[PDB]
Amino acid sequence: SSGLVPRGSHMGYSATAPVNLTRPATVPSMDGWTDGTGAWTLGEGTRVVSSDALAARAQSLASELTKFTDVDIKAATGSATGKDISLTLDASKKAELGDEGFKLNIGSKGLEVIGATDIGVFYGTRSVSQMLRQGQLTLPAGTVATKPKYKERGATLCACQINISTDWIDRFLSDMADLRLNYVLLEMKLKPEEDNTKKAATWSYYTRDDVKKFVKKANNYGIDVIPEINSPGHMNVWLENYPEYQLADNSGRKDPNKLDISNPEAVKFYKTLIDEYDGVFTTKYWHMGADEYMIGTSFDNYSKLKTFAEKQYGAGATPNDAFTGFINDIDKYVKAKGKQLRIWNDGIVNTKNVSLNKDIVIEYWYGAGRKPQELVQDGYTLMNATQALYWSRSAQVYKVNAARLYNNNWNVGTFDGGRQIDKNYDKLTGAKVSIWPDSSYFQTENEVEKEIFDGMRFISQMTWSDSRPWATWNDMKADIDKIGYPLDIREYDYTPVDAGIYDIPQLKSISKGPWELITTPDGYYQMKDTVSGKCLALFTGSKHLDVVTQVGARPELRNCADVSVGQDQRNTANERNTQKWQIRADKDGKYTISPALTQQRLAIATGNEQNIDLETHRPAAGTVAQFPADLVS
Template sequence: MNNGVFAFPERGVTLCASQIGISLDFIEALLERMHQLELNTLIWELKIKSPCWELANTWHYYTASQVSQVLALAQRLGIEVVPEVNAPGHMGIWLENYPQYALKRLDGSVDPEGRLDITNPQAIDFYLQIVDEYLRIFPSRWWHMGADEYMIHDSFANYPYLAEYAHRTFCTSASEYDVFNSFVNEVNQFVKGRGRRLRIWNDGIHETSVVHLDNDILIEYWKDEGLRITDFIQRGHDVINNSEVLYWSRSHPPYRVDAPALWESNWDARTFIGNQYLSDVLHGGDRKQRGLRVSIWPDESFRATEHEVWEAIQDSLILVAELGKYGVKRNHDWRTVGMSSLSVPTIADSAVSPGLYEIPELNVVGKGPWRVQCTPDGYRTLEDTSCGKNLTLKYGQKHLGVVTQAGARPSLELPADMSASWPDGWENAESRNTQKWIISSAVLKDNSIPSQTHEVFSIKPALTGQILTHSDEGLAQWPFDSLQGDSAFTFRKVSL
């Protein structure tokens, strides 16, 4: 332990869990691990099931009670959980059923990235109402609005009315970035009115001549784009080091935190992206860098399972914890710090033992019996031995490559090679990971005790976060709070 004296007040993790979900088991294990390592801040990008915007309640979402469960644990562990809903970009999961609030190209189309129309007062109010819903649940001192990559894979040229709005609202020398800054400032004033502070990613902020960003907004500096880190410091902003070298992704090749290499190099907590080094700059006696954070991004989420993510991030958690506590490297041998003596919390594993089973509720897709086997990352496969194919959840509407469609139906597919694990076998990850299942003990609806001859389990696709059900209409996955059918499956062991 560090006896409560830390180099930086914030030492933490960003967890993106908005388009596809991250299980509560994972989040709670992450909080426990953060507590062990004396990390104290979790940025949680998420979608909460909205009581006001019902059309936005497509999977994935968390319920308010689930969020409260996480926040109660975080409070016990002394970790501040900061909510994030990204705007004005990356709003696809909110705008896909509210296109009237989205930017529209010259041809009238709305792209799936989901860009909020920040010239539309009703669209801005739409976002602020979402913010208000979250602030009623989260006690954090902060609100994170993202504000990154507004024009990713696109161009302002496709939305000329943004410039027209800038000229009409401000002056003829104003640009789209003035409109952008104005929107961010409006959100800032809104959250300050509710006793909170705003933080944003840095890349959307460029030099402007008319509307300047409020200097009480904290800057999460991750990308070498827009204003430089010294520009923000000189304008009075607090900053966090979220450099891309501290980014972890399930699929984007450059985002692999190489903790040993970073530790044994000249890089340290004050090295920002683009070879920008922030010395111990003091303004009014206060250091402006509040800390550093590792970020866990989903991207093409079928590329890796949660269990693989859990294993992959451990080194980066230790790296940030060590630098966040001490500020400097106490030595340059990663082996002395990279092996934490603290036991790593585990994520719940499947309950059913490997073997051959009759599972009558699966008869609608295969004759059985079903062979249950373990995968290297702790899941199960279900093979219909009558045809030699595995139960798979591969088809349906997707977010980030994962089938999020409620009511999507499983199929039988030729078995994938399960010997590979992330990042090996990257190209065949979809076939492999869509055949993985979480099989957990289930409670019978009448609370009866299972027979000695069989056990009852629930079955969840490893990637989707939904639950498999059976009914007269067949098998399908459904969110836990809107099951359409029975989620109990009978497993009868077959004697060989």
């Protein structure tokens, strides 16, 4: 027989290690590792030791490692031994480590993590978690210091029109943290509550309490959550119930997507929303969008804006000057609140009388004038938001291809359309992937999470390390799958109840049941009515992005769709995904039932829920309907 037996090395340091023992990979890579003698092993008695000030980080790392490794790892203060992981914050190391970088020293004093800031220490703990959660508890000795090349590294998460659930957002922030990504542009509606804005409280929205909760989670992970309220285009979710602020074309036809920037009360409405957001986000930035104001049309059909431009910005001014003026006026407004403005690059165009303020960050997604190289010449600050890094649920042109970008030598100076700029440009802030819903029934948010996995590791690698230490994409892919997700995602209880047959009293207005529940690959349920043999769907009501957003919409029974197939089955997507339900357990133990695509919650309608949609249609009192969770708690 082979005599095969676990090696079982003692915990702590050993001067003996084989020379080519694997060093578990990380993402981002930690480039320039200097090898040392021996190796260190996490084992019984290993602790996470730190100062009092680092106690919370030490405790959180010890609990996490206890879960991944099955060894009881406790946090402690005072002296570290060779059996231990030590956390040190040394702010004098700014030159070597900067604001986010860290150094690991693995040797006879144990596994030392050093950062110059709290977030730098927390980012080194992410590499310690990644290295120890891959089935190997012995790490080769040596040392490495690493810091990100670019200051802003992350994603656009567009939680606009449709709702991305807060549980999804919380997983996404844990994943960003794991990959050292520090930037999320969250385009989203914070529920407007004032008399003058409250008729825009249509769904999707997020409550102030929920925003404060995920902003606090983000900030503990070193993530800047930047709100966007896109303007003066893509304003349907805000202007639908405010036609007084909508821009009319020369024939008098109003577009709920366009703010009338010539109407000072419409501009004041936008600023009022900025002041509403100010109390729940902590960032120093405001993103006002500014893409695609005249998509589907042209300024020639809005002569009122040329008249306005001439009055406001002098004879010869054009609608593009009025458009840029509006952005500069919002820049003035947010700067007075201590923020810096950011916009998308596309509407920045050809001005005469007005020039765009240089203190506005330009997030460049669309090779549309200027070219990147022109904007560099003018000294603008630029973030690379190339369409090569887009995903959309419906627009199959936008699916990140990480293999292609890794193998074709894309880097953060490769702007949209392969327009290369110097990747060392001193005002290149970094780069981001962008996650857009578009027609939103083709993919559930859980399928979006499965799909973006590789592209999120790709952007993390190229914005921190800017290197390709894996010979090909497929070599990186093998390591990122071994590294896996961070603990919070592995612990999320996607399907808290077993498949089986259930009584569900909340559904009696639809059927007396009982109901057969089965689970789907993406973490939801189909609910079949054993009386009719049909399945519960949330299928009908007013929609945005082809998803029912109507507050008070009622579910219905429809012929059972096949919920076991993947997102490539696009021809049956809508029947299939309108039949998926997310069940969640309360703190503690009551269950709520949500349509997977809408992320509202089923409830029995009382007639006392207050919402602009309900001013004009209410479900019959006592029937089961969906409502935002805040109207039904």
